[PDB]
Amino acid sequence: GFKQDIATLRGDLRTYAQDIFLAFLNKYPDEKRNFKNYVGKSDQELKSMAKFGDHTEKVFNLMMEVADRATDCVPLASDASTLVQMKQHSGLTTGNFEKLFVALVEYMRASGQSFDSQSWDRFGKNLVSALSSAGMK
Ligand code: HEM
Ligand SMILES: Oc1ccc(Cl)cc1Cl
Numbered sequence: 001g002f003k004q005d006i007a008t009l010r011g012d013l014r015t016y017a018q019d020i021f022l023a024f025l026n027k028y029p030d031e032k033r034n035f036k037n038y039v040g041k042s043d044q045e046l047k048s049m050a051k052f053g054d055h056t057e058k059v060f061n062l063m064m065e066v067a068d069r070a071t072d073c074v075p076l077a078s079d080a081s082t083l084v085q086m087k088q089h090s091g092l093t094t095g096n097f098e099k100l101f102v103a104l105v106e107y108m109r110a111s112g113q114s115f116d117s118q119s120w121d122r123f124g125k126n127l128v129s130a131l132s133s134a135g136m137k
Pocket of ligand 2: 056059100
């Protein structure tokens with residue numbers, strides 16, 4: 001289930017974080033508008049860029065804590081407001097997060113690992129509602 005998936009992802013976090021982020025970046029090319037440094041680079045070149053690995057792992061470190069602190073895939077309001085008020089998130093809209101989670105759920109279903117794919121879909125939707133309620137446009 002959802003709780004076990006957090007453990008599965010944490011068990012190989014840097015790999016999963018990179019592959020999910022790449023799936024997101026390649027499903028939605030226009031999203032590199034927020035990642036100017038990742039343009040014109042194949043997946044293997046991205047994985048050799050120090051900040052690509054370091055930043056993506058830190059994102060997914062934090063995502064797993066927001067998931068872990070959730071109840072029934074509903075994140076805490078204190079976690080949602082942290083994501084909105086984050087300085088690095090200044091220009092983001094909730095579409096950014098909705099698209100991230102479509103990619104992540106698509107990746108899980110294609111994985112052959114036994115993820116609770118529907119729970120992550122719910123979690124992504126619930127995170128998006130909590131981002132709007134916390135002020136994100
Ligand atoms: C649950 C979802 C997310 C979590 C937990 C999260 C968390 C984080 C964290 C921890 C950082 C800092 C990384 C570092 O400084 O090393 C960060 C930076 C950043 N995030 Fe998010 N994030 C999420 C979703 C998104 C989405 C959907 C976007 C855009 C589509 C986004 C755009 C950015 C940008 C532009 C930065 C700063 C630039 C960079 O670090 O390369 N984030 N986020
Ligand atoms: O390095 C990253 C990977 C995924 C997401 Cl959503 C954001 C960042 Cl900064």
